[PDB]
């Protein structure tokens, strides 16, 4: 089991799914096409901002 971690803008949370493209899906962090496991995303406006 491996648990990654990062903080991205709210608009681009849809972009971590496999098979997407953009400025956070090809130049920073790209998931493989045959991904297993799953993503746990939640708003954190209280702490980061």
């Amino acid at each position: 089991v491996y648990a990654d971690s990062f903080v991205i803008r709210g608009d681009e949370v849809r972009q971590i799914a496999p098979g997407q493209t953009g400025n956070i899906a090809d130049y920073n962090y790209k998931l493989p096409d045959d991904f297993t496991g799953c993503v746990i995303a939640w708003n954190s406006n209280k702490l980061d901002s």
């Binding site: 496999p18 098979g19 096409d33 991904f35």
Partner: protein
């Protein structure tokens, strides 16, 4: 391939390839019948000679 997601592309293309392979089995199973009747005419013409 060029207008839909890669993770869901597997089921779409797999739908078509099974269709062709099923359609290929129909062609061969007709020749097995056809080859089994020319075999009769190949075994009666071997008698008149």
């Amino acid at each position: 391939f060029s207008r839909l997601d890669k993770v869901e592309a597997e089921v779409q293309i797999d739908r078509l390839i099974t269709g062709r392979l099923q359609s290929l089995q129909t062609y061969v199973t007709q020749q097995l019948i056809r080859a089994a009747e020319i075999r009769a005419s190949a075994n009666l013409a071997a008698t008149k000679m």
